Amino acid sequence: SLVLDQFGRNLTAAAMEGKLDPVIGREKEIERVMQVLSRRTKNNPVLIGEPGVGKTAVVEGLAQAIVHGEVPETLKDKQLYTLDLGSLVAGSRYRGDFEERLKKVLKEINTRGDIILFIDALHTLVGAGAAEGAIDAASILKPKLARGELQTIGATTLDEYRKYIEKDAALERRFQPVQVGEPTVEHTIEILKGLRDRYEAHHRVSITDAAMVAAATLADRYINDRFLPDKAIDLIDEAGARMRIRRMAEVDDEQIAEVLGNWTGIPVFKLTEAETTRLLRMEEELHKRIIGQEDAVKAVSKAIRRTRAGLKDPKRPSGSFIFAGPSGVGKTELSKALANFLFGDDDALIQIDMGEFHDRFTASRLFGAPPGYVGYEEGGQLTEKVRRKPFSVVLFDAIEKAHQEIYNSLLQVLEDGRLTDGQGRTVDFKNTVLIFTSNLLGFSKMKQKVNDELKKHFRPEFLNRIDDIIVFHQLTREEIIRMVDLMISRVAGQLKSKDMALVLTDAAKALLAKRGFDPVLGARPLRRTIQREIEDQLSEKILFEEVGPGQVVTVDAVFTFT
Amino acid sequence: VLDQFGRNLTAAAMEGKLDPVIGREKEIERVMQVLSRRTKNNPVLIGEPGVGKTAVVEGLAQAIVHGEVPETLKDKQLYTLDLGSLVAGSRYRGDFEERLKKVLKEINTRGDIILFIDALHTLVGAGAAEGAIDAASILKPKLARGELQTIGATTLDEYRKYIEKDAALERRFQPVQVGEPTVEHTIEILKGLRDRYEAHHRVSITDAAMVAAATLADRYINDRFLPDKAIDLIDEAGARMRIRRAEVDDEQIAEVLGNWTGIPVFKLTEAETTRLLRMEEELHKRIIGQEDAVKAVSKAIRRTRAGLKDPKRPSGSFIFAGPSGVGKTELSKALANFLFGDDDALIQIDMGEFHDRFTASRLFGAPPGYVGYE
Amino acid sequence: DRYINDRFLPDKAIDLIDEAGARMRIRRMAEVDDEQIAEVLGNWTGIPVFKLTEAETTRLLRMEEELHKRIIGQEDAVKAVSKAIRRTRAGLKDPKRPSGSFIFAGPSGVGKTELSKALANFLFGDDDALIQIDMGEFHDRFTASRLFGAPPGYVGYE
Amino acid sequence: DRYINDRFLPDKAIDLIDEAGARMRIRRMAEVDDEQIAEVLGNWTGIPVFKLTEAETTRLLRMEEELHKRIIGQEDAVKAVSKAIRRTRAGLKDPKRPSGSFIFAGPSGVGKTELSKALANFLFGDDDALIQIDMGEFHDRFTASRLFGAPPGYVGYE
């Protein structure tokens, strides 16, 4: 045929030439579509499945099965043509052109009688060649699809099947839905083990077996927008193409996990000995940012080291924490310290201010409006911020200020790592670090006191799903002395930018401590009375220009500045 | 692709027509990393308008002709593809599909074509709609097999509205983030683009101007993006030099920027230090009387701007207490016109209508599903 | 004019005359009376308006007994929906009102939905011929557009 | 000008002159008057603007008595829709304002819809000539598009 060559690609001739990828696995569904093609009436399989699962590949695996004789006798010597509906609409301008090109195609399929037709994107069959008075491609094929005198394979996304095929109910019973499911990991492994020749030849790399096990395992676990076959092939291709630029070569699993680390932003890569040394000395690097508060700095370090050892539950988040304690002692500052440790940015912290969830009607800010409602397509602050960054530190600041029905949205967040938004897209929280910070006698003879206040306020199944409940110490006076050392170093950092020093005395650091420590708050006031009583009186002396580069400013409001 | 809907950027880089692409080399390497893949070798340059997404591809097309490509991209004639011109002329059935299949047939025969589709969000529903023969569904089979190499260029909003929303198109394309350059990166761009704009305008452009173009466009222009906004200052100042004539300087950039925003060149070409040195006398011009208030806020802004400032505090927080209308919002307008040069920077929220916490969901936005969302 | 609102008087009435005359020219290998008009209208709207068979008349008078083959007890409501159907088949129902409007109220499980299914199987032979609008899925006002449709210029208008 | 909103002055009025002279020349097979123009406007818009015949003048005199053949009691309401129709046929209503504007209110079942149907049965001989816009299915914000139509380009505009 030559009519089918200009409106279609012969996949049987492409499988003779070895131009189709080998379809290793998926034999149970090639067998399934050969049953539908062998039918008397309605011999038309539509391959419905998610994007990536290999719907087009099964038909390419059928075309490889025809050229090898692995088909039944009623499918032998069939020429399978990927019918390009766009090529049929192309070259039409006039009334009756597209209908004439279809009748010429269907005349050749009737004449030869050895054509399996493959309409990839079968949802584009409705409204194909539709115009001022034009019989569409669907209405012309429907008499032949219903009587079995045209053997057409379709392939449609499950989304595009419910949106376009099921909206034409006379066309959905022209086709048999063959479920093309996403493969399991061990099936995806066997796909990669069979596709290893095409990717070792394209990238001139050597893809090892553990790389393909890791490409299928780490893709199901850490990629949640694409589908098994692709997501894992994507890790193989991007690793072989990254090694193509390195030689401008063996692809191990560390080359796969590095590609996944560059792409999801989830640190999953094989541990650098300098990075392991960073994780082992995590606490004292978190103690650079926050002073004291050891039973939390030791406890969020155990959660991150449990993640990077590969010892966390893959069905739960990386860490779940109540930072309970008094105000001002570094509940948010540790969450920012943990975000700087994992990203180098305070703005990588997803801070959800739970104070403005005070009623029970603002929970759609977390997960989006349900369908029908305003902000259904722009819906979910918490869901969209983690759909984009799966590895995150999510802060729920002042968790007791929220209504107690906002926690019930976050229960299966803690237990399952799931938060299905209002659109219905489940967002993976399995790699987040969830932090719930909470500001919330007599004759005898704080951790017992605070944990009972949580049991009174929070639900018993909310606290049951928190990994670590951490009560915070009120900072002692000597811990305030170590904090004024830390908070002048911001001022002293931008003063050494001008080459001038700022050295305080013991009386100056004690006076900041007496003006910064409160039984009400604590440290928070200390941050204020340094940027109001040290930083302001240095800024106007830069304005006065009585200081300069090559000077030291000793300090002993009532503070002295030389 | 013919030279009918696109433009050979590889042949443009042979004749030295593409502007030099300074920086953005992590992105050109990332685009090569996508284009060297076997299947779905289709990068999307995701950025903002004017961050240099076309410049990454111009830098790639230069890297093809200089042999800096990894023997998968060697001698690839990179063509653009104006899908806007490709849709244009479709008033009849099959016009768009015919002009796209001619392009797609031309790539099939030559086999060395890399499409650059600027505005790849236009691909969805370019012919009719999502479930219809559009440009997306025509290209989706060959994009999924690596047989059509296509560099896209959307913004971050348009990638999320059109490519992520379209199932079976998010997989075909690989996101390559092109961020907005920093100011120091933009000065390196302008110094690399220095010989192009000096030779075009026949006007010498100094290092003082290019630092001024990148710094002041990041400050004073906030609807556009660094690389472009700052190049447009260099380009317009060299153009307005031609209508005055030999040298573009710091003050020449502040003039052509002052004609855009409306700031007087002085408020652009100043120096925070001096800029706030005679602050008191300029705030007396619309506040006469209550002089201790002006000298208090002039002292406070000069403390909380000049010298030391943490980036974790606003420029100043003030409670204006006292009798109403004696210069309360009259000083704040007088402070706003001093702020960077525009009186139109004062915003009255008018909290008197609020006596409700439920109306705080009608001031900071509503939860979605409720009134007060727009 | 009574049993059609999709068509217009002259034609619809000519439709009944022409098709009953065409049914009788099939039977003669001959007179078209009002019973043959009502057979044609019953074949076409699906509304039983034709003259009652003595077997069907016995079935309507023995309706309470034949609904009690599926509904144990509840004789107050079995006779209430039987009075509604007999009022329709006697042609004594208000032509402007529906054949019967009922609120089956009471306790859970005692056969409110089952009588509606028994009434639908009595009238049609299938209890899946019951148009069952389950009102629990109407939770706020805006789901009323499931009943009558979307207004013009909104999705699902067609 | 008064009784058309779809045509334009020159012809709209030549339409009345020409068709009245055409209706008059069918009668002589010779004077077209004020009343002959309003008969043509009555045939064409459907609005009774023509001079009342003696059978119809007394019918509007006894209209409250003719509405009481179909509604029992409600005398204050039958009079007030009688004051409105008789303003219109006396050429005497404000022509910047509908011929009658009424809130029928009160208890359920006392003849609010029945009077509206009786008023439409008076003026037209049939109560299905009532444009009955049942507003209970318009409780959505945007079902106003059923009353006036979709804007152009949005489905169901035509």
Partner: peptide, 24 residues
């Protein structure tokens, strides 16, 4: 309190096929 955002469906159709006038 809630608002439903409706969804004004637009009328969108493919371009019209035309019928040609012949000039010999």
């Amino acid at each position: 309190m809630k608002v439903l955002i409706l969804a004004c469906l637009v009328a969108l159709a493919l371009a019209r096929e035309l019928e040609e006038l012949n000039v010999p």
